Amino acid sequence: FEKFPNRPQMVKISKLPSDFTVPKIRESFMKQFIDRVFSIRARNLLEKETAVTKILRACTRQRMLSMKRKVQEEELRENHPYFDKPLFIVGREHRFRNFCRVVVRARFH
């Protein structure tokens, strides 16, 4: 795969005019993005203290809530169009592939 040139998938929307450029942006980024005058006031110590307390509360909340080969694997998956898709037509995210995976991997003093 490394021999072939890279060509990552890009965002494409069909329901748009023909004069709309549809800027160039990666599909993975869009997917993860969607899935997820007086200055006297700010100089007061009270405002700084409030901001710091807000930061500390956020940090406490976060605390409460809480290799190279694999990196290459995702890099290749992102760069090339047909990777991990068997026979080029099966579809890496097809329902029938899920059915095949579940039936094949089904296992059980």
Binding site: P8, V11, I13, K15, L16, P17, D19, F20, T21, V22, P23, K24, I25, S28, F29, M30, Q32, F33, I34, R36, V37, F38, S39, R41, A42, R43, L45, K48, E49, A51, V52, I55, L56, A58, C59, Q62, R63, L65, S66, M67, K68, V71
Partner: protein, 654 residues
């Protein structure tokens, strides 16, 4: 170990110099140091990355000798203030004499500050609880002693940070990575890392006598912490798997910026370190990594408009961020600014000014790049993309995001951004035409207007989904349903109202192109229809500013002469007819219905009927009048009756 009058002073003095010696020790490794210090039970005084469960309980003695002491509890988040309050309550001390008593350790000769955590000063959890004393003295002397001791302890902590930095710097490269890796883990295991790095003795800075020195020490310590974090980051592998815990580190930087934004040196260091981290973690910051830094930068930017130095620095930093990560950076910036948009938040004008700055080149006043550990040309991190963008590109990006997932929260945020941004762009165009009246300026104005029109047409085409119709859960659902529609109506009504009249006057100089195609008028009308369908059930949709602005401020401006466009009006008229028919059918709705907005709806209708009389022949309007007069009569207030009679008069005239 041994008590002494000048013990902590000696420790501070030693620490101020230890980091110079540490640079000359050959085989000093983190593991050995940690194990030795732990075995000696004094690691806290040397390593900032030291975790020690503090005393569970404390014993305090009163004024008299051998009087009943008190055995109070100590938790993980208890400060000496609550302990002192409990002491006062137990010892029956009048409130008038409540500012003369302080808790101090006679053995170690320490006078305790109110807002310093107890567990920090007594990390040792031994069989013996520390003995404190409630000593009475003049408030001034107590404050002076507290200032002195906190100054000394801050010096100690500065020395510790310096020691760690020096140790990290002076180690063999082959063993560097693992070392820094461990330095992360310990920091994550600390229950009080972010607080220790960020928290400051605010209440003491106000002291005129000794606040300046404390604040200087604070800014030095913050700078050192930032430097240490940068060193730790740059030692890691570039593809380290980060979770949300990254914030716990990145937020530290923010803590400095909030406190000392106005300090040229600290601001420079912050900018340089953020740029270095972004370059190092290319994959992370190219995906979701600017959602942690940017909000605080925007807040400071907006809150210090009067500081051209700070503004220029932030603009330069954002320009470098763009030159690095290009469009993902802009999208993440919009996501980060959406929550703070006001239209105590970032105004549409501050955002517009920041984008304006990004539109051009900015000089390095502070010489930030000197501190940047990367290639000075600083080419794009991703090989896919040498260009400069405009606001039009940002509008395109927002439109594309909306089109991709119209029914999503991020789409809502992008719509808000667009609503805040478009009017400023229009004003910019107007000003540009004004200052310079040359013909090419006019030509560029037409071209920009055309581009924006096409972009908004694409938006309206791709936002078809919202056309569909339809206790706290109900509120949330309705809010989500109506906000995007309101924002779209606002954007398009404002665009048409501003430009349309401007087209004639501009064309006066030196073939008017339709701003919005018929299909887009129909789409906007059926959006308004979907919104009206719920409007009688919910008061807030009736009060909707965007709905009212559309009905009474755009329907009169569109030229309904074209039979192709007319059905967009017919749909709205039919919906108004059906709606008022319902209102009249059952008085149950009529009991709680608010009619002041509906008067504005009728006012929009008759405004259209006045502006173009050609509307009046179409039959669907007659029925609306009839039911309306029927609805008049059990008596609508004046503001509605006046509108109804005015509509009747207009119809008669037509």
């Amino acid at each position: 170990r041994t008590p002494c009058e000048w013990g902590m002073d000696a420790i501070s003095a030693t620490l101020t110099f230890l980091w110079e010696v540490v640079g000359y020790v050959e085989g000093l490794f983190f593991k050995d140091l940690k194990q030795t210090m732990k075995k000696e039970q004094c690691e806290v005084k040397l390593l900032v990355t030291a975790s020690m469960p503090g005393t569970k309980t404390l014993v305090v003695h009163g004024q008299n000798e051998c009087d009943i002491p008190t055995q109070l509890p100590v938790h993980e988040d208890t400060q000496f203030e609550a302990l002192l309050k409990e002491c006062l309550e137990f010892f029956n001390i009048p409130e008038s004499q409540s500012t003369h008593y302080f808790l101090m350790d006679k053995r170690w000769n320490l006078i305790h500050y109110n807002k310093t955590y107890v567990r920090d000063i007594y990390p040792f959890r031994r069989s013996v609880s520390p003995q404190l004393n409630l000593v009475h003295m003049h408030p001034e002397k107590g404050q002076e002693l507290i200032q002195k001791q906190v100054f000394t302890r801050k010096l100690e902590e500065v020395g510790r940070v310096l020691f760690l930095i020096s140790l990290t710097q002076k180690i063999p490269t082959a063993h560097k990575q693992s070392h820094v890796s461990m330095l992360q883990e310990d920091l994550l295991r600390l229950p009080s890392f972010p607080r220790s790095a960020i928290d400051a003795e605010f209440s003491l800075f106000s002291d005129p006598q000794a606040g300046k020195e404390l604040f200087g020490l604070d800014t030095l310590q913050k700078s050192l912490w930032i430097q240490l974090l940068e060193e730790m980051f740059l030692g890691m592998p570039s593809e380290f798997p980060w979770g949300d815990e990254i914030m716990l580190f990145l937020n530290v930087f923010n803590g400095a910026l909030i406190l000392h934004p106005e300090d040229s040196a600290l601001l420079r260091q912050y900018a340089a370190t953020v740029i270095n981290t972004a370059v190092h973690f290319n994959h992370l910051f190219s995906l979701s990594g600017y959602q942690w830094i940017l909000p605080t930068m925007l807040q400071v930017y907006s809150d210090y408009e009067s500081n051209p130095q700070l503004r220029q620095a932030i603009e330069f930093a954002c320009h470098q961020f763009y030159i690095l990560h290009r469009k993902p950076f802009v999208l993440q910036l919009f996501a980060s600014v959406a929550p703070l948009l006001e239209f105590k938040g970032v105004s549409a004008q501050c955002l517009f000014d920041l984008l304006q700055s990004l539109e051009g080149e900015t000089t390095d006043i502070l010489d930030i790049l000197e501190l940047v550990k990367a290639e000075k040309p600083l080419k794009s991190l991703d090989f896919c993309y040498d260009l400069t963008f405009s606001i039009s590109e940002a509008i395109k990006l927002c439109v594309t995001v909306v089109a991709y997932a119209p029914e999503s929260f991020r789409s809502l945020q992008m719509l808000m951004v667009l609503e805040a941004l478009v009017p400023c762009y229009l004003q910019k165009l107007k000003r540009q035409t004004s200052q310079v009246e040359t013909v090419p300026a006019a030509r560029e104005e037409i071209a920009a207007t055309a581009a924006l029109a096409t972009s908004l047409q694409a938006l309206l085409y791709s936002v078809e989904v919202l056309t569909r119709p339809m206790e706290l859960d109900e509120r949330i659902a309705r809010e989500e349903f109506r906000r995007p529609r309101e924002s779209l109506l606002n954007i398009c009504t404002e665009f048409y109202k501003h430009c349309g009249p401007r087209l004639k006057i501009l064309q006066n100089l030196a073939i008017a192109l339709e701003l919005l195609d018929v299909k887009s008028h129909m789409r906007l009308a059926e959006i308004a229809h979907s919104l009206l369908k719920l409007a009688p059930y919910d008061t807030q949709t009736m009060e909707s500013r965007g709905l009212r602005r559309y009905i009474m401020e755009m329907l009169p401006i569109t030229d309904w002469t074209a039979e192709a466009v007319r059905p967009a009006l017919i749909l709205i008229l039919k919906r108004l007819d059906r709606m008022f028919n319902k209102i009249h059918k059952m008085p149950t709705l009529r009991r709680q219905v608010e009619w002041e907005p509906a008067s504005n709806l009728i006012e929009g209708v008759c405004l259209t009927l006045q502006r173009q009389p050609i509307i009046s022949f179409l039959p669907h309007l007659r029925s609306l009048i009839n039911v309306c007069v029927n609805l008049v009569m059990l008596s609508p207030p004046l503001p509605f009756s006046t509108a109804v009679v005015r509509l009747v008069a207009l119809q008669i005239q037509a």
